[PDB]
Amino acid sequence: WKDIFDMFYDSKTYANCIIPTVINRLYKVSLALQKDLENKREQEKL
């Protein structure tokens, strides 16, 4: 798979191209899901 990437979808620019892609998810589906849920957790008791 690394060769799959690096053949021509390579240089990490393609990765850095895709890096934007689902950076939404980290808060679109992950950090909105959690730190809003952990702003509960972390402040749930203490």
Side-chain angles (χ1 to χ4, degrees), residues 13-32:
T13 63
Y14 292 71
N16 188 250
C17 286
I18 293 302
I19 275 166
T21 314
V22 291
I23 278 165
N24 64 357
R25 287 199 53 258
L26 62 77
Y27 187 87
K28 186 75 167 58
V29 297
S30 177
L31 275 173

Side-chain angles (χ1 to χ4, degrees), residues 1-2 4-5 7-9 11-13 16 19-20 24 27-30 32-33 35-36 39-40 43-44:
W1 307 1
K2 187 63 168 67
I4 282 160
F5 172 91
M7 206 158 192
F8 295 79
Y9 291 2
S11 68
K12 301 185 148 282
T13 63
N16 188 250
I19 275 166
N24 64 357
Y27 187 87
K28 186 75 167 58
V29 297
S30 177
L33 193 147
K35 214 76 193 297
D36 307 330
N39 293 348
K40 176 262 288 181
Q43 283 105 26
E44 168 55 19

